[model samples]
Target: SGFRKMAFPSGKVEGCMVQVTCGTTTLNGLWLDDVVYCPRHVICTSEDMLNPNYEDLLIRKSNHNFLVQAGNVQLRVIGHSMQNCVLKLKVDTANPKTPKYKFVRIQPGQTFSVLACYNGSPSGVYQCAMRPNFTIKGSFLNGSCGSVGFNIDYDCVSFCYMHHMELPTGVHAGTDLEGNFYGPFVDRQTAQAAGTDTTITVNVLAWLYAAVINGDRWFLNRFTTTLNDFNLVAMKYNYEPLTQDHVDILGPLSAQTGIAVLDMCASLKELLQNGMNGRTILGSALLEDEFTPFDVVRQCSGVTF
Candidate 1:
């Protein structure tokens, strides 16, 4: 007589919770209609990498406002910010001791059912919170960056405010040795082939912070309608992700007002050029309490673009 050996095929279905455990090994995947996202702890560094090459990102656990999770991560995103939001999730393969972060982007009063799973192995064990990029270790972000509420002084604007969901420069934000592509350099024309994402962290982060540092004390209050006109253009796209297209549109507004901003004033333009030249944004010197751009923008918000 002959006997047959049974085999269990492995696969994941869209909009469903599943797992395949063969004792020592495990697997996870997500697929669907016009949308496909999967997870696993990886260090992928590719532009437009919808990722995982077909496996679990191992993001394991949690919801929005937090990225890292443990044990069978069940995830979803509800846009709470009163803006046109874009929620995304991906494994942070950029950092070495990396944890796959839960990417999120949705609009206020909107819900996106992401993924569901039971905590598998290395995680799905204990409940946790957001991981810090500075210390590069998970102990709990109590006194770290945004850990402080109503925080005026921010850390990495690209990471925190913008979520850096996509490579802002369409390139991986490498270590400090390679000129960390987040701060001032971000606003430069040579950073990316195309700004990988909107919300120009460079424009909004160090570059602007440095602007506030230099201008707020002297020139910010001057130029009555000039500031009004300039702000109308700058804040116009606040609701949209800052992309190259937006940058292209700002050229005229910048040409008209950029000199005043860059020079800080024609009288000091010659002397200030060299003074404004320094590469310290990488160190967090730009994120001081002199003025809060975020709060200022909110306070100045009017019924216009």
Candidate 2:
């Protein structure tokens, strides 16, 4: 009988060990005891970590003001796909702590137009801002923030004149140098085109005439004065013939007011020369004519060149 004993290595072993095998090795089942397994160590397969969503932020508002009456006051909030965006119109007094706003919902791809009743006074400012929301991820964040501000500083005198003017058939009330007048009925598209063309022509004519009368290099330091003086002389009594309608309309006012049409013309001409430009001067002229047409005709009527 042969017996063999296997010794377990103790302490520290050095160098290489030679394996000594017995004819039959003891066969035994090895069991791992109290082994702990944790799934927390396993990597999370969710992609939420890679992609993140941020909340919308408020940017800034643009302020604008217009002087007009009896038309639609449109506030356009534009940008990305803000289709489901909420627009709030607020009127704040003192500080922003208290705000009165007409909350309105707007669809994307459409401009919001509101009808405002201007009382010919300086109303407070109007503000517009984007709606706030979270869970909006990706590139759709651009339209998430924006705002605009505007004021209604309607001049009483100008407003009254525009309101009382008898607009010609097919003519729409618009801002012009003269208060009001009959004009070619045109939509925004047509008006824009015509305005561009007319602006170019008028500008060219004004500059050309300035150069012609005041000399090529003469800066026409007071171009407004020159233009106004010319218009006064042109429309003054005996300068140009008036139409029957013009006379009929303006005849009585001239006799009653003692406000000479020539004086008004001179005033408007001066306004123009002073860099008043086309719309304003033209609108002023129209206003003067509408309110005091009779006076203008009476004072400016008669005489031949």
Candidate 3:
């Protein structure tokens, strides 16, 4: 009776959870439909608030942003199987049903593609001439999508320019002036066969230095994983040109430290030449929380390795 007497969590009545009363009692059993009208102020939800198993899904189900490369991109959402949820993109704000670049829905078996701007230029690191932004809505067909507006906002940028060149004969291995080792250098042709680039612009020392300077978990994760993997793959096989996916991360990382990529590379080389290796610099700076060791004066070494 009286909307099943909401057993909302203890809080102000104005903004408290509304317990699902449907099927709870003989009186509540009579009320069956897509919506239930409560007698007093309450917050009704479309999700099973009592089920902890759905916690992960609930956490990620709504309003979030994603990054993607422009042009023919495929999209998918994880943790959607249980609810059979789907993501729909709102390409046009006005007249959503327009046939020309209107809203698009992605289905399990169906395919989709999106157009985005290209980033590259004759100038130093050309930006995306025509970046595209779109808003995506999420909902489940089997049931109400939690009475919450789930949206995925995403944008697209251009690709990365890869410098291609062959390494000198027998110049297979080397270390940055700092001691950070790089390369088991393979032939350009051999590297290309392995789907990697030939250049080592994003060197190990430079990457480590950037991570140390940035001092962020996100920055460290990308540099050590995606960024490092890209460089290593290129070293082993050939230079793999960076796609927008890679450049997007690289650009932010490069900008965050307020240091140019080439500048960082050169600095790392000089640091290696002094004494410290990349790993040592990181361990000393991070674990010990001191950079004076890095600043320690060094006696010049005349030996050329």
Candidate 2 local Cα displacement, residue 41, angstroms: 65
In angstroms, the error of model 3 at 178 is: 41
Order of candidates by TM-score, top first? 1, 3, 2
Instruction: State candidate 3's TM-score.
Output: 0.19
Tens-digit lDDT string for candidate 2 (1-305): 11111111111110100111111211110001111011110111123213312112212222221111111332222221111111122211122121222222221111111111122121122111111110111111111111111111221111110111112222222211121221332212222211211111122222222222222322223223233455444453323222334334433543444433343334434443454344432223221111122112222342121
* Reference-based lDDT, residue 119, model 3: 20
Clashes of each: 24, 30, 15
Each model's lDDT comes to: 0.25, 0.21, 0.23
Return whichever of 1 and 3 wins on lDDT.
1
What local lDDT score does residue 99 receive in model 2, on the 0 to 100 scale?
Answer: 22
Report the C-alpha lDDT of model 1 over 55-167, residue by residue, as the tens digit: 22223323333232323543333211111121123333222222222223212111111111332221111111111111111122111111100011122111111212223
Tell me the tens digit of each residue's lDDT in model 3 across 140-203. 1211111211111222111111111123221112111121212332212333221222332332
The lDDT, on a scale of 0 to 1, for candidate 1 is: 0.25
